[PDB]
Symmetry: C5
Subunit: 322 residues, 5 copies
């Protein structure tokens, strides 16, 4: 009866795992998941599978035999969807040796949930993992381990992504507990991710800075030229508002506060204050004309104060986000 | 014949349910649904499943036995789509004890319809539920209950969402009736949802307020400077219209009136009225010049009246939506 | 042989239908279809299904028996896609009575084609239907009818949609003909749909109207102030063009002429004419100065003529679309 | 052995086809394909299927018999995806007559590749086709033809599309050759498509034309009014650029040159030239003032030359695209 | 036992491949993959499949026989998803000759990963490939080759794409190694891709260039006209910012630096510098008036220097990207 595991009732059966990674097919920021294609290999010794031959060499069967014999039942923990490839036929392999050591191999694609924090965007780093576990059998019945330690993971040379950079592949293990079912062995495949920083500096942190620098030109124009100093500021407000909407249309769409939002909103406040400045100046000059019937003090102070505050802002901001 | 339930013809069979929640995979606002992955467990006593062993301990089978024996038929009420995971094999478990107490377990993902009201957006709170029912059998044949009361629900520590905050998981039960079929027992899994308010305050309720404040600067400029007071107002109208279209491009897309729409439209009316104000002033000054051949009264009254009305608006608005 | 219908060769077998509607899952305007989840019930009398019991009460089987016995073959006319739910097992029920009266029940989701006319958008009303027919058997072999007349349809209390309002559920029947196959009986489920009008009035018919009102302010400014009357009109053109593009980005995307398009284009023409007006005025004043070396007549006539024409436009427009 | 065709080894078996079209479900411009739902019927005479009855009338089986007997193997040439409907059961019909004439019928949806040329957009016309072929058997084994000539195609009265107009359904046949396999018979279903022209005239060819007409107003304003003639032109440039981006956001997205692109770019050049015109005029007047210390000739020539060139452009353009 | 290959234990079985390409269904730039539909053919000699007939001619079976006999197990290396077509029945063919030479044929669609570099966009060229391999058997058991060399690939005459141009189809072979499994034979189908350059020149490299040319007009306007030279520059900044956001909304969405980005950002810097220029000029004139109580030198130098620098930029840029 190939429904009972090898060594039933006695000690747990040692099953060993080997993995090779093919590709990383996609990543979704809004749904917080990633998709991967890999090869998965198993090993064990079963005597009901022995045969009399002198060759001392393995012999090959396929998926049809897999539905007759007994086989492990690993599954992917914290997955959203997976499948096994089937063209032009099932991507399954089964090799059987004279002494009874089986090898069993699959090709699969998995989508796995990854929790991500965007508060430092775009200067963040994300960490993700793939988890492997047996579904039905506890650690007293089935024992699970990496076949050759840290060397039981292999990775493909052309694995790439359009939005990210990948580094630091390694394996770990950990024991897990379910309250209604027991203690299970679990294996992990970990890696790290990062973005192209110097592109975001030019896409977002550059136009805003130029706009704030453009609002300071007003302090050097003659206060007598009202039809020239009034339209300049409000057009500058318009430009900055347009920019803040273009950046939002090109970003992934997240609804809590991010690093880049802070910088843009502060630049906006600097440009709004410049408009209030000249309104004060105009009003004071006008009441002086009325009272009686050279650069203004507020102009020659603004020319110093505004840039220095912006410089202080930048120092603190980049001390916090580094 | 494992087509007749245990206890056929006599009294109803008691079946008990246990649940553990894995993840919340996605939420759709336009279609009004959510997607969830969970583990589902059942329990009962059947004597046709007894076997002679002294061990007083459970013994394990899998999905192939499930197609031979009799098994409950629960289903998900008010679901749009669901499925059972099958890699690397069916995520199914079956454990059978010497006295005949069966345990049966599945891994599944469900999308369930949730009715939502957006009239208070973005200050709303949404309530959603998952419902479990037997398809074929009434309460006189099958009896359904939570195995250990309020403690029959377990939830994962890293359950998270990018747009929402989750709280208040608990269980309830209720009897249900179909007119052509009878009375059935139903179980419920309830929870609550909310948004990040202080992000929306800065994304939407901040730029508009600054714009209305910018339209008030006009009352302090000299009425003699026509080429300076005329372009200011119409450029301010342009800026506010641009803003009202950016917010609409970044929101989920709903076609009845929402809280945030009201605030934006009222700000728009304030800016339109400021333009009509100076047109009155200009016309009156001009006819005075013609008649005959200092700040105007309407200017020095507007400087008080406009801000006070806006303050009254804000008081009432936040008294209504709190 | 359960491949021959009950009453083969003699008279047609009467089969009766009962329906209960669960939810309306989605609607697509571009592809012209809707998606629905319902319960579907059948009834008939078959003697090969009789059994000797005294109970005078029905007894329950499930989907496995359905593959052995004979069963109707209804299908959904003018559907694009459908399916039967299968978690945690097939959503199928079969109840069999001592005298041989079978009851058979399914849970299904269907997407059905609905032809829609958008010429009156957004003041339109759409009518849609679900059609049920037997695939293989003509009216001389199988007879199909509603079990209890108008009362054979039941509907759920919380059926809702985010963009529409639903009303007027009722049933009808009609005989249908295929040229290569014969006459068949058909059943229908009809209902009506409508939009939230007073939201569209504020989203689209309000900003344009304010813009046209803003273009009339120019007639009251002094014709001597050229740098003040020239930029006003062209900025107003810019604002109206921006608005006409935002509305188009927020609508469903249809490529023939709709009611709302007409109103927007007419407003655009009014604003373009205002610019041509002042160009005439300026030119005439200038040639007068040249000839020789008070309000202009065209100004004081425009102040009356423009609003009156707009009022005439609105009267006719709302007499046509009501 | 129902694996050998009727008439094996001798002459080819005549199989006849009949078709009725239900709906046209969708069209994709970017991927260049369309999706269709239809009924497909076959006919032939097989003697291994004869039975002794006097009725001289056909008798009905279904899909389960289809898996036992022999049946044709038609397939859809140049399809991307297809399927057969299966709710509430397989949409399959089989009718068998006393003399052995079989009728066999299916309901299916197909997506078929259609090659399209967009160079004349939006004044184009597209032609598409559906192709039917036998997969395994050459013209010496299986003979394929339309059952009743041009009358073997039927079409539904409410077939409609939201973006197109459909006309000219007819059938054709053609012999085809594969180099590694042989000569096969092929059947075709052809039709024609077109757009709503007079909507595109108003959506795209109208605003641009008004803008070019607005740039000509500048020639009639007094050259002495620099602060009035300078902002007019550059604001007009801004408006035209905005328009050219809105049209691009509402079109299907194709990356070679189209008819409508040409018209928009030429209008853009006309508006840019108007700005250069006044710059010349201003410079010449200024140097005249300097030299010494009425309408300008370039103004009164532009008033004639610009409109006449635009009229010439329109004549040629509509002579080419008609 | 048709589970052992022909020639088991002795020498490897020679299997030969032939391919014909139907269509190229789609391409995704963000996910870096392409989708293809093709016919795939195999050949070999097996004696357990011989039959006694004099005809010296092949005889036809179908997919049902394929599940009984032994058959190769090729698969698609570096694929994301594939499938075999099944309407109206499995697209499978099997022809068997008196001497035992089998022919076996399939119709399939595959999506295959293609690594792409966008740094030269839009002047890039991409190279892609399709790879074929045996899953279970090494080169000592199964030998794989192209049936007729370079002539074993055929391609369809109407293969086309909406965004690209296709050229250079040819075949290659290469031996491959897996560390846990052995050496395998691999076949390749290669081709080349390119874009429509002269469309992108007009869509992107034309408006920016005109804008930079428009910013140079300012050097020829009289420095005394402040209300005419100040609004011109800031409106030009606004126009250029708008343009840079429209291009980004119409491109595929990639997050590292591309060729076209560089050109746009440099144009932006030229327009910002023009505004700073007149601010210097105005300030110097004003202090001169104050000191004392003709074209400026910076104006007549700018008129030469700005265009020459832009010309130098273009020379270098097109020397680098050619
Ligand atoms: Cl971010 C934005 C506008 N939005 C664009 N899309 C959605 N909201 C905004 C927020 C704060 C401030 Cl200070 C200025 C601006 Cl313009
Ligand atoms: Cl909300 C909008 C424009 N739209 C943008 N997308 C769709 N409509 C609008 C509505 C009312 C008022 Cl008072 C002002 C404006 Cl700008
Ligand atoms: Cl509706 C549009 C521009 N488009 C925006 N998206 C696509 N086209 C338009 C059409 C006619 C008139 Cl009179 C004015 C305008 Cl602005
Ligand atoms: Cl069509 C476009 C801008 N784009 C908008 N989306 C993508 N590019 C443009 C092209 C040529 C000319 Cl002469 C003027 C303009 Cl504004
Ligand atoms: Cl490209 C962009 C704005 N963005 C539009 N969408 C996203 N960012 C920008 C970047 C650099 C410079 Cl110098 C100018 C501009 Cl306007
Ligand atoms: C491939 C391999 O490891 N083969 C071994 C061989 O080395 C050893 O001599 C034999 C025992 O006789 O068992 C087998
Ligand atoms: C992170 C990781 O892969 N670590 C382990 C390392 O810590 C251990 O010391 C070594 C030998 O056991 O193998 C490896
Ligand atoms: C909301 C909820 O979970 N409630 C019940 C509570 O009301 C009840 O009193 C208690 C003991 O029965 O168990 C829990
Ligand atoms: C549930 C029901 O309708 N049962 C009927 C019963 O009323 C009737 O007396 C009997 C004939 O003896 O047939 C059965
Ligand atoms: C629309 C509809 O449901 N109509 C019918 C009604 O016309 C008929 O008179 C009545 C009794 O037959 O039942 C109901
Ligand atoms: C429906 C039909 O065409 N039936 C024919 C009948 O007309 C003819 O008389 C008979 C030969 O006896 O064959 C059968
Ligand atoms: C286009 C088309 O359907 N054509 C044929 C027509 O050419 C032919 O002359 C006629 C009779 O054979 O039948 C039809
Ligand atoms: C189609 C074909 O190649 N047929 C060959 C024939 O040429 C040859 O004469 C024969 C041997 O007798 O084998 C077979
Ligand atoms: C690229 C390619 O297809 N190349 C080969 C060519 O190099 C070789 O010389 C020839 C004969 O072997 O066949 C072909
Ligand atoms: C979490 C602090 C946000 C501060 C935003 C300030 C915007 C001017
Ligand atoms: C709105 C501007 C008011 C300026 C007042 C300045 C008083 C010192
Ligand atoms: C932000 C500028 C403040 C200038 C204050 C000047 C007081 C004399
Ligand atoms: C939540 C961190 C806010 C940091 C603000 C920094 C302002 C310079
Ligand atoms: C339901 C009341 C809506 C009021 C909208 C007012 C817009 C100015
Ligand atoms: C359009 C402005 C008219 C202003 C008239 C004011 C009469 C008191
Ligand atoms: C909204 C301002 C009204 C001002 C009225 C002044 C009447 C003298
Ligand atoms: C439907 C509620 C409208 C509330 C309007 C509040 C205006 C201050
Ligand atoms: C079908 C009549 C359309 C009229 C459009 C008029 C646009 C100014
Ligand atoms: C382009 C404006 C011309 C105005 C001419 C008016 C002649 C009565
Ligand atoms: C649309 C306004 C026309 C004004 C005509 C005035 C003729 C004296
Ligand atoms: C096709 C109907 C056009 C109606 C135009 C109404 C103009 C007032
Ligand atoms: C194929 C000719 C294109 C011409 C484009 C001209 C744009 C000004
Ligand atoms: C940039 C404008 C220069 C105009 C020069 C005109 C010489 C006839
Ligand atoms: C495009 C207008 C050209 C005008 C030339 C005038 C030469 C005196
Ligand atoms: C490729 C056709 C170009 C036609 C240009 C027509 C310009 C009037
Ligand atoms: C990799 C060099 C980028 C240079 C960008 C310059 C933008 C002004
Ligand atoms: C912000 C403009 C300052 C110009 C100073 C020029 C000194 C030579
Ligand atoms: C970019 C223009 C520089 C002009 C310098 C002029 C120095 C006299
Ligand atoms: C990474 C290549 C940068 C090339 C810059 C060229 C500037 C002319
Ligand atoms: C905004 C500056 C105000 C200065 C008041 C003296
Ligand atoms: C004259 C003060 C200049 C300040 C520059 C930061
Ligand atoms: C808009 C203010 C009008 C005042 C009339 C006296
Ligand atoms: C002079 C009146 C000022 C009012 C500020 C709200
Ligand atoms: C646009 C008005 C023109 C009037 C001609 C007398
Ligand atoms: C003086 C005429 C006013 C007209 C208002 C509609
Ligand atoms: C742009 C017109 C220039 C005329 C030179 C005489
Ligand atoms: C005075 C010339 C007018 C030309 C109109 C096309
Ligand atoms: C921007 C030009 C400055 C020149 C200083 C002499
Ligand atoms: C007078 C100098 C002109 C320079 C044109 C590039
Ligand atoms: Cl001025």
């Amino acid at each position: 009866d190939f429904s009972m595991r090898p060594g039933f009732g006695g000690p747990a059966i040692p099953v060993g795992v080997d993995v090779q990674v093919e590709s990383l097919d996609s990543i979704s920021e809004v749904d917080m998941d990633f998709t991967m294609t890999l090869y998965l290999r198993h090993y064990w010794k079963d005597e009901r599978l022995s045969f009399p031959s002198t060759n001392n060499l393995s012999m090959t069967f396929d998926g049809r035999l897999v539905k007759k014999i007994w086989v492990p039942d690993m599954f992917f923990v914290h997955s959203k969807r997976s499948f096994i490839h089937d063209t032009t036929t099932d991507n399954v392999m089964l090799r059987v040796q004279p002494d009874g050591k089986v090898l069993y191999s699959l090709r699969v694609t998995v989508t796995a949930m990854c929790n991500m924090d965007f508060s430092r965007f775009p200067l963040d780093t994300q960490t993700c993992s793939l988890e492997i576990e047996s579904y039905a059998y506890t650690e007293d019945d089935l024992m699970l381990y990496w076949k050759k330690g840290n060397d039981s993971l292999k990775t493909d040379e052309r694995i790439s992504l359009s939005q990210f950079l990948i580094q630091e592949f390694h394996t770990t293990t950990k024991l897990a507990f379910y309250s209604s079912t027991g203690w299970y062995n679990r294996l992990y495949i970990n890696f790290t991710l990062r973005r192209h920083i110097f592109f975001f500096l030019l896409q977002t942190y550059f136009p805003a800075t130029l706009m704030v620098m453009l609002s300071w030109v007003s302090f050097w124009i003659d206060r007598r030229a009202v039809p020239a100093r009034v339209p300049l500021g409000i057009t500058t407000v318009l430009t900055m508002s347009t920019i803040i909407t273009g950046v939002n249309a090109s970003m992934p769409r997240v609804s809590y506060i991010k690093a880049v939002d802070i910088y843009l909103w502060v630049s906006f406040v600097f440009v709004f204050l410049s408009v209030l400045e000249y309104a004060a100046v105009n009003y004071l000059t006008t009441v002086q004309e009325r009272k009686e019937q050279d650069t203004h003090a507020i102009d020659k102070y603004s020319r110093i104060i505004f840039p220095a505050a912006y410089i202080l802002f930048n120092l603190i901001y980049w001390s916090i986000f580094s």
